[PDB]
Enzyme design. Structure first.
Site, PDB file in Angstrom:
ATOM      1  N   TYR A 179       4.319 -12.192   4.998  1.00  0.00           N
ATOM      2  CA  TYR A 179       3.284 -11.985   4.272  1.00  0.00           C
ATOM      3  C   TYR A 179       2.793 -12.742   3.147  1.00  0.00           C
ATOM      4  O   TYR A 179       4.151 -12.869   2.165  1.00  0.00           O
ATOM      5  CB  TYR A 179       3.425 -10.237   4.087  1.00  0.00           C
ATOM      6  CG  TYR A 179       3.061  -8.946   2.887  1.00  0.00           C
ATOM      7  CD1 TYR A 179       1.883  -9.708   2.491  1.00  0.00           C
ATOM      8  CD2 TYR A 179       3.531  -8.460   2.695  1.00  0.00           C
ATOM      9  CE1 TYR A 179       0.553  -8.977   2.201  1.00  0.00           C
ATOM     10  CE2 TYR A 179       2.472  -7.785   1.545  1.00  0.00           C
ATOM     11  CZ  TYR A 179       1.200  -8.085   1.562  1.00  0.00           C
ATOM     12  OH  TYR A 179       0.739  -7.611   0.843  1.00  0.00           O
ATOM     13  N   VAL A 219      -3.842  -6.077   9.175  1.00  0.00           N
ATOM     14  CA  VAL A 219      -3.326  -4.845   8.453  1.00  0.00           C
ATOM     15  C   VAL A 219      -3.582  -4.524   7.916  1.00  0.00           C
ATOM     16  O   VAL A 219      -4.773  -4.629   6.440  1.00  0.00           O
ATOM     17  CB  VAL A 219      -2.111  -5.764   8.049  1.00  0.00           C
ATOM     18  CG1 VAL A 219      -1.169  -4.420   7.695  1.00  0.00           C
ATOM     19  CG2 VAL A 219      -0.593  -6.700   9.587  1.00  0.00           C
ATOM     20  N   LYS A 260       0.944 -11.744   8.121  1.00  0.00           N
ATOM     21  CA  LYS A 260      -0.219 -11.248   7.329  1.00  0.00           C
ATOM     22  C   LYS A 260       0.345 -11.662   6.596  1.00  0.00           C
ATOM     23  O   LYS A 260       0.132 -11.819   5.651  1.00  0.00           O
ATOM     24  CB  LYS A 260       0.557  -9.671   7.015  1.00  0.00           C
ATOM     25  CG  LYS A 260      -0.825  -9.043   6.154  1.00  0.00           C
ATOM     26  CD  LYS A 260       0.005  -7.955   5.443  1.00  0.00           C
ATOM     27  CE  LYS A 260      -0.402  -6.938   4.835  1.00  0.00           C
ATOM     28  NZ  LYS A 260       0.336  -5.666   3.953  1.00  0.00           N
ATOM     29  N   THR A 263       0.649  -1.351  -0.179  1.00  0.00           N
ATOM     30  CA  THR A 263       0.137  -0.031   0.395  1.00  0.00           C
ATOM     31  C   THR A 263       1.054   1.512   0.069  1.00  0.00           C
ATOM     32  O   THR A 263       0.581   2.381  -0.265  1.00  0.00           O
ATOM     33  CB  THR A 263      -1.266   0.128   1.275  1.00  0.00           C
ATOM     34  OG1 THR A 263      -1.856  -1.691   1.493  1.00  0.00           O
ATOM     35  CG2 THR A 263      -1.853   1.127   1.565  1.00  0.00           C
TER      36      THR A 263
END
Ligand code: NA
Ligand code: NA
Ligand code: NA
Ligand code: NA
Lengths: 292, 292, 292, 292
Positions: free
Chosen positions: D135, D205, D163, D47
């Site tokens: 992740y 998250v 995550k 992001t």
């Protein structure tokens, strides 16, 4: 408004040594399920091997279950297929034998559009006074009943529920929000019972309840109470047991698990096959892992 | 043994305004096909709306086509469903009305394993002396008949071909390599006819041959004569026309296309629906683009 | 119009015992490719482990391959990444070291839109006067460059080709039709070499050509001469060899295959790993099955 | 044991009118997040447009966020890429500028095996004393970190969390169960916050906490208390707002949404593009529907 409760069980269809419906074992299984947390019974669903039952077996199976259940829980007959006219016909016959509701699967194999499915479910709903439960199952029918489609259908008076076996609690969420409060959204995936309920699903149309019905009711009650840790430990058992029940094409594993816990309901019909010896040993271990 | 040629057509089933089979229109369509490049007729396949035909309508349709075809090309009856015993019974009835072979789809909806499909196809194949074509179609049945399963089944004497609608010429390649030379591998995707034949496919089980069979025949002959630029231009037409025939659930668009070229074969049965006006217009433009 | 011929090879990057670029083995590998059917060399593509090369190493490798090739085949540098401005800087640097073209992959990981990719490719292609080859590879970048985006990009003067590793000869067909005749379409999948060329593809950006480039050339020539049965036999060899080269993350298998045939190009950088002993044994058996 | 709380936020990277990191806006964003429910900040993740930041920019961004946060919440630096060596290097640099943890994505584009990923994460984790969050993002990297791979990695001392943006709360369930109790499993999908926490996830998250962190915080406090009516209601808001944030490639929608709630953080770097006027209007309407 008909209430299917928090655990509808998609019952297996017990077969005898010749592969015929074993009616006496069916009686026994029906009473066992009602004694072990089942709050409604879906008869002749996928798990009841609807594909290999004949129309007249289905009708007779419906008649017998209605009679044994004797109004103790709603009896939902899995009458929809991928042929609208045959679905209307079988729905009329189910109604005639006293079932409380029908479950109508998204047409498999011919891949209808959303509008085709709208008209299909509309025409089957319109042929009966009974409540209708839609059944979304892209993992077998390929197509999905879109949220917008389910919402349009929920506006029909006797379409009152959906069994969403799409594996996606976010489409479930959206259906819950967009339909009236008297439209019941069920998970169609045992492992998603707890998360689906967290987002507002009324409960589960279950396979695993054949063997851990009571634990599932305990899980659900614990969660609703805010007892997260107790609910999570039972969710873990549910997911583990569910996984073992789909090691092979369903419902052979659950029919086998039932045999392993004292309730022999026969084998399955081609093209489904008995578990292999190694599959059986794997399954028995998982079964032996359930707290007694 | 039996030779289906390069273009087997999965014929539509003509209906009248009320959805009933229109046997006189079936006569005209069969003769039309046979004179426009069809070398074998698949009757009651997916494209023939087998899901919405009753077992009795299927046999009547098989009989009518056998009788109209009059041995001019092989007649293949789509007898398989996802119910092995039912498939046996329909296969026996097709054999007794004089079809030349049967086609057997991978069971849809119930998601059998490789061994389950092995046993399903063997059981059906051993119930008839007729040649049998397997039909792999994971875009409708979800499961794929694996290469190893296909090869195992190709060792059965009367299992002679496969219609592979898996969209993958590399699996078709491996099937070709691993089976004997007397096992014919067909594409089940019109657009892949040319690249499938390039890797050694015998031909195509076609939908588009209802409206461009002669162009398809010229395409195949151009290819086989090493006229690659000619074959490629016909291939582009074949690809473009096939796309437009799949813009709504098949076989509505091909039934609509047929009507647009003067052979009105009626509409489709629920859950399928006629094209919308907007759909009709997009399809008419494509049809008008076919070089005349 | 620049011409890459029928077999562009996505060259591996030889590494020494410390993981550094091995310049002597790079020379040896380039000369070997040129004598074994490679008509153009893609340097620093996915097969060249572009993800684990630094920017400086990529440019050094471009520079070295350019000097070694000495204008004998076109040198295509894989300069595109998922960062448009970095791709512009790297493309300029490749342009300055005298490569003949750049190849630009669809941005992986950040999932750009069709219009984002349009701008991404447009801006990089404007940064250089060299010919640009697009590279569509959804099984690594998730996104695909749509037909219409490919067409729009083909109207840019120096965007002259696409390596299409989408695995779909019908989208390739559609790109061929809608783009001008001077836009070259390559398969990006070795096993699809023959069927893609059947539909008008220019040839293959290849990995298997590191070990069977001569057979690939014979296949293509057999095919173009209409020697179908000869093309098919070598196509079967191509497919079988290709599959063995993808049983572990590429390019470790093709680097190991090169070592097995006497051309040791070292191992791979993390996160890729050497083949396990069992993998090696399995690859060695396929390599021993190539007719000598 | 490090505690990231229930809402870790993957912060966007504010850019100025020239596309450069806007450090003054980063300060303002950081203080805003901390006052609106964010309990840990992930800096330079997906992001944060990690693909378009240079290594120097990331380190400067990490160092700046560390200074601004001033130990108020943990700072997690998104240092992993698909190159193990580069990941070790960047992880060392983030450690030196005082971040509290690093987040390591599954390598995208090069498609490592499970053992490859195991070696990749192991070697990065060994190179730093800091806590590591894995992740999993198969929707961007294609490969998934298998449950068994995650379990093996969780046994490494400084690998403390994952995550999981896999969209599947059943694999999360299995990771929770098979790992020790001190291994925190976060959802990486906002819409799954509630269902994932219901099965045992420690939190989210998040992307949507940029504009509805207070509502997510309330939703989570409601859910943990057992007030499912308020939780379900905020869950509906969260699902709808999240869907509006991914209608174009992320993070352009949440950057635009930020501007709409009065915290302009600039625009995005190619290959990402500003929202069209049309998208901006549709987004703005969703932003307007948020109770203020
Ligand atoms: Na509702
Ligand atoms: Na063969
Ligand atoms: Na062209
Ligand atoms: Na754990």
């Amino acid at each position: 408004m008909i209430d299917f409760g928090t655990i509808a069980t998609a019952m297996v269809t017990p077969f005898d040594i010749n592969g015929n419906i074993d009616f006496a074992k069916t009686t026994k299984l029906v009473n066992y399920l009602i004694d072990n947390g089942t709050t409604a019974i879906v008869v002749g669903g996928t798990t009841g091997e609807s594909p290999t039952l004949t129309s007249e077996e289905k009708v007779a199976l419906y008649r017998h279950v209605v009679s044994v259940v004797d109004k103790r829980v709603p009896v939902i007959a899995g009458t929809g297929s991928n042929n609208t006219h045959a679905s209307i016909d079988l729905t009329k016959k189910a109604t005639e034998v006293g079932v409380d509701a029908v479950m109508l699967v998204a047409p498999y194999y011919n891949k209808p559009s959303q509008e085709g499915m709208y008209q299909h479910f509309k025409a089957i709903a319109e042929s009966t006074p009974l409540p209708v439960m839609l059944y979304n199952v892209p993992g077998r029918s390929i197509v999905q009943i879109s949220v917008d489609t389910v919402v349009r259908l929920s506006e029909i008076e006797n379409i009152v529920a959906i069994k969403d076996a799409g594996g996606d609690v976010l489409t479930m969420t959206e259906i819950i929000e967009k339909t009236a409060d008297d439209f019941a959204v069920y998970s169609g995936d045992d492992g998603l019972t707890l998360p689906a309920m967290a987002v507002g699903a009324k409960g589960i149309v279950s396979v695993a309840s054949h063997v851990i019905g009571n634990e599932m009711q305990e899980m659900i009650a614990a969660f609703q109470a805010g007892e997260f840790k107790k609910a999570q430990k039972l969710h873990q058992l549910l997911v583990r047991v569910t996984d073992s029940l789909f090691m092979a094409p369903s419902p052979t594993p659950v029919k086998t698990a039932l045999q392993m816990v004292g309730l022999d309901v026969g084998s399955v019909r081609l093209p489904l096959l008995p578990l292999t010896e190694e599959e059986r040993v794997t399954l028995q271990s998982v079964m032996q892992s359930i707290p007694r």
